[PDB]
Design a protein around this ligand. Structure first.
Ligand code: HEC
Ligand code: HEC
Ligand code: HEC
Ligand SMILES: [Cl-]
Ligand SMILES: [Cl-]
Ligand SMILES: [Cl-]
Ligand SMILES: [Cl-]
Ligand SMILES: [Cl-]
Ligand SMILES: [Cl-]
Ligand code: NA
Ligand code: NA
Ligand code: NA
Ligand code: NA
Ligand code: NA
Ligand code: NI
Lengths: 106, 106, 106
């Protein structure tokens, strides 16, 4: 898919998590986020289309999705163990990565 | 190792997983599959030898391996906790990732 | 960051792990190693500056950090289980990835 729909998926499944009731709900939301953050890593954002694929920005752009993916991995295991409040707090720390990427490349 | 060898390692250890006697067997095969799926990401597939390494096709190629590695991560954790038939069930689902990539790039 | 600083983060935290007593230290050192190996992945080492970003050596350089990241993953899960010494044993095998890369690209 393209960047905006992947971003949609991230944002909407982030909303599920923040209001989610049970571990199951968080786990399936984080599973869809992980899929969207992977798909998104193959995209060239409008701000860097005229920048090289091997430029420091594209690498840092792609790097940011590696950070997000690993943070989603952490939240996901906590949700799998049932620690629902602990996975949500971790989703809360996720948002800093989101906002850090927008500041730079959106 | 080139693509074909990495594919052979994946094929073999999937077969080990489905005929596996114990969680330990599942765990060692999925580890081999993790190493192979990471190694295969370095290659250009024959169907794309004449495409840019920055083309949408090559990104989706490599992306296919990120999906597989994470599916392997999930099955790996299931086998690490002894859920031998839960790792088998999920190993069944990652076959879909194999077939989809073959359909597109083999 | 630049490679040399990320390498310092890897080396210093690897020490913490080898001398640490409780899982909490190992866990937080492995998390800093995760970020370092992820950020180092952006770099181009002095040995390969004469080489295509798409060269086999460069793919193999970045592959090396994917292996390291995934070995950190397993070590980290062992620390999170409070298995401090199991985690230290896996850090001992992590080192082989460091030296191999050094031998090839440093
Ligand atoms: C870089 C690595 C990013 C990370 C990490 C996250 N986002 Fe993102 N976001 C990014 C870009 C480059 C853009 C703009 C792309 C474009 O084509 O306009 C966005 C945009 C969004 C949007 C807007 C959707 C739209 O219709 O324009 C949303 C709702 C959004 N981002 C959400 C979001 C969330 C919830 C994230 C973390 C969980 C997140 N983004 C991370 C780049 C990056
Ligand atoms: C793309 C992202 C792939 C995924 C995921 C998987 N495979 Fe694959 N496979 C792919 C290509 C491009 C090729 C052709 C390689 C070539 O050089 O011709 C293959 C090939 C195979 C083979 C044949 C190997 C041989 O001896 O020629 C096998 C047995 C195979 N693939 C198995 C396999 C399995 C079991 C997978 C998931 C567990 C899997 N592949 C994923 C591309 C991709
Ligand atoms: C490639 C995939 C590497 C892996 C894996 C590891 N290291 Fe590394 N290291 C690498 C390079 C290319 C270099 C040279 C960097 C430069 O610009 O000079 C290094 C260097 C180091 C250093 C020296 C840092 C300095 O002050 O010059 C240290 C202390 C170091 N590396 C440690 C280290 C450890 C502990 C690793 C595993 C835990 C490891 N490295 C992995 C490339 C690669
Ligand atoms: Cl890209
Ligand atoms: Cl999980
Ligand atoms: Cl491995
Ligand atoms: Cl990619
Ligand atoms: Cl991190
Ligand atoms: Cl790579
Ligand atoms: Na970033
Ligand atoms: Na063959
Ligand atoms: Na061969
Ligand atoms: Na199909
Ligand atoms: Na790099
Ligand atoms: Ni894990």
């Amino acid at each position: 898919a393209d960047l905006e729909d992947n971003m949609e998926t991230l944002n909407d499944n982030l909303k599920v998590i923040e209001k989610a009731d049970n571990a199951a709900q968080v786990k399936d939301a984080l599973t869809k986020m992980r899929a969207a953050a992977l798909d998104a890593q193959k995209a060239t954002p409008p701000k860097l289309e005229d920048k090289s694929p091997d430029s420091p920005e594209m690498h840092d752009f792609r790097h940011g999705f590696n950070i997000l993916v690993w943070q989603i991995h952490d939240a996901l295991h906590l949700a799998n163990e049932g620690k629902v409040k602990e996975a949500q707090a971790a989703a809360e720390q996720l948002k800093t990565t989101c906002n850090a990427c927008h500041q730079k490349y959106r």
